[PDB]
């Protein structure tokens, strides 16, 4: 009868409508609703967007010419593609899209149900599904369940790679192709060796992973680590040092995950920007480095055709016009692309020798397909305008193009940044709420007033 | 056979729109929860069935 | 009847906002077709 | 393109990816209908 009769208002909850989801902190049933419905939204977008991409897909055109980001993900897994990443069958794309879209109906159903029909709190209904945020045992148990789920997922990647068709290998002998991985890298020195690599130039931390064996082996390790970890956390409870180290509340847990996800978003940004192994340039377009290198390659080829001796051609500055040395002596491409000499790609590597680019191979062994690929990549560099005018900022309208690597890198940098902000927000607030002054300073007990003057 | 497929799929789309509107409404509606409940069971079963039917029929036109 | 409240303000807001969305959307369509499209 | 059979649904497909946005917008309709209480 009254508009304040329910608990869904500021009067009952203490929270304004613009912070209305904070009203869910201790309503585990409805919160379960929120989470499951949101999972629904995620899966929905995957399915629908895949179908949209597929409907707009001209399979003999390069994916990256067509504003596609999901079909590249499916294709990287080996589905729908053949040698060189040619589309041989679109039906797998279709299946992925449809199944995600149908699944989103189920998630959405359970979400709406739990959100507005099921028990608003779970604790009285079930001790298993109920929880108190302050109960470190129960929390670590749920963390464990979900760790096990993640481990299973990583192992699913492994199983796809080893027993269900393999993965698309841009580095495959004779040209990129789908390949079954039969000898995953299990040696821990290599796997965790990646984790201890510098993030800086020519090292690139885990973003430098450059072969599918390391990838697959890495996912074996991560899957096992996660399942083991989950078991550990189901069977244990946080130790004293941990207890005294952390804030124990829903908002705090949320802040921790926001920090984690921020970090992961930045990492993803760099992965799609630099890595051309798990983001094959066949599907995503060339990296910036790659396209730059490709320009140098293109004109080295043209001028050498015209008669230039490119090994001995001195450029205006004194450095070689086409070829020069890196600071540690390797023979690298000249011009500004001197910054990108760490680049590695299947079209360029045959020209590489022990001391870097090999003059004899350059003079004698450059194949037509290499010229083709260098030209293509040079002319699909990841530069372009917000309205998808391809090329440098001063280019005229004509080409409709922005690289998938630009879209993915920029989107995830923005997201990672705001999630860092969200981390500071909810971490600071969690500390203040646990300590009891998130609503402000108590006038009758203002802490600074009981402190000695600074001076 | 093609128009049959198009019909079962169109059925799934229609039933889907009907669920999308009618399920939250039923869930949040005061009166007639037992009736609405039975109908949500019905809609859900028919939905699943139609997804499976379209799934199967797919491989006789595609 | 100048009676204030006969139409629920949330419906007015929803319709009005949808209207704004429609018109802005038309302008953005216009950026890709006809004059100003570069084609 | 979608498989030929499904082609009549192309327009629907063209619209589907935008629906999650609608949910965000719906959150504000709903709140308006309960006075942002």
């Amino acid at each position: 009868n009254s508009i304040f009769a329910t608990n869904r208002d500021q009067e009952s909850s203490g929270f304004a409508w613009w912070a209305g989801n904070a009203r869910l902190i201790n309503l585990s049933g409805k919160l379960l609703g929120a989470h499951v419905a949101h999972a629904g939204l995620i899966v929905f977008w995957a399915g629908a967007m895949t179908l949209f991409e597929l409907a707009h897909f001209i399979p003999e055109k390069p994916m990256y010419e067509q504003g596609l980001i999901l079909i590249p993900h499916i294709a990287t897994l080996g589905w729908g593609v053949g040698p060189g990443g040619e589309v041989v069958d679109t039906f797998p794309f279709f299946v992925v899209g449809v199944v995600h879209l149908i699944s989103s109906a189920v998630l959405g159903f359970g979400g709406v149900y739990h959100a507005i029909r099921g028990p608003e709190t779970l604790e009285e209904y079930s001790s298993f599904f109920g929880y108190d945020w302050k109960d470190k045992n129960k929390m670590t148990t749920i963390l464990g369940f979900h760790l096990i789920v993640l481990g299973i997922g990583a192992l699913l990647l492994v199983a796809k790679a080893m027993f269900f068709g393999g993965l698309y290998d841009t580095w495959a002998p004779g040209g990129g192709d789908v390949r079954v991985i039969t000898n995953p890298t299990l040696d821990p020195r290599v796997i965790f060796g990646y984790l201890l690599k510098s993030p800086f130039g020519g090292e690139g931390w885990i973003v430098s992973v450059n072969n599918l064996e390391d990838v697959v082996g890495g996912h074996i390790w991560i899957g096992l680590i996660c399942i083991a970890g989950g078991i550990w956390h189901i069977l244990t409870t946080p130790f004293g040092w941990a207890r005294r180290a952390f804030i124990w509340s829903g908002e705090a847990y949320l802040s921790y995950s926001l920090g984690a996800l921020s970090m992961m978003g930045f990492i993803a940004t760099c992965f799609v920007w630099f890595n051309n192994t798990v983001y094959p340039s066949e599907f995503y377009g060339p990296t910036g480095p790659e396209a730059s290198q490709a320009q140098a390659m293109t004109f080295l080829i043209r001028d050498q055709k015209l008669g230039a001796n490119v090994g001995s051609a001195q450029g205006p500055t004194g450095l070689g016009k086409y070829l020069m040395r890196s600071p540690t002596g390797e023979i690298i491409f000249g011009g500004e692309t001197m910054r990108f000499w760490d680049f590695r790609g299947p079209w360029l590597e045959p020209l590489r020798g022990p001391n870097g680019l090999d003059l004899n191979k350059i003079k004698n062994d450059i194949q037509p397909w290499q010229e083709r690929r260098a030209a293509e990549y040079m002319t699909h560099a990841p530069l372009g305008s917000l309205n998808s005018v391809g090329g440098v900022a001063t280019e005229i309208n004509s080409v409709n193009f922005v690289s998938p690597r630009s879209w993915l890198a920029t989107s995830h940098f923005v997201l990672a940044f705001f999630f860092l902000v969200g981390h500071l927000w909810h971490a600071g607030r969690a500390r203040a709420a646990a300590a009891g002054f998130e609503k402000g300073i108590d006038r009758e007990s203002e802490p600074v007033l009981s402190m000695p003057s600074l001076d | 056979m093609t128009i049959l497929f198009q019909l079962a799929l169109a059925a799934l789309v229609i039933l889907s729109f009907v669920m999308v509107i009618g399920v939250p409404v039923a869930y949040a509606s005061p009166q007639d929860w037992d009736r609405s409940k039975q109908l949500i069971f019905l809609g859900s079963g028919l939905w699943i069935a139609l997804v499976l039917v379209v799934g199967v029929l797919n491989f006789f036109v595609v | 009847m100048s009676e204030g409240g006969r139409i629920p303000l949330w419906i007015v807001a929803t319709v009005a906002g949808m209207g704004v969305i429609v018109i802005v959307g038309l302008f953005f369509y216009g950026a890709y077709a006809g004059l100003g499209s570069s084609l | 393109k979608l498989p030929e059979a499904y082609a009549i649904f192309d327009p629907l497909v063209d619209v589907l990816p935008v629906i999650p946005v609608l949910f965000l917008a719906l959150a504000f309709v709903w709140q308006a209908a309960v006075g942002f209480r």
């Binding site: 329910t6 507005i116 | 729109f17 999308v20 509107i21 939250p24 409404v25 949040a28 509606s29 005061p30 009166q31 | 629920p8 949330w10 419906i11 929803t14 949808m18 | 327009p11 629907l12 063209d14 619209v15 935008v18 629906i19 609608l22 949910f23 917008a25 719906l26 309709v29 709903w30 209908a33 309960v34």
Partner: peptide, 29 residues
Amino acid sequence: VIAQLTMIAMIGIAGPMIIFLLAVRRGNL
């Protein structure tokens, strides 16, 4: 492009229709 606008109109009306319908029969909004 008629079917696109029509579909996004139906879909687009579905949400506010749920809100309106519940508000009318004084449902648990």
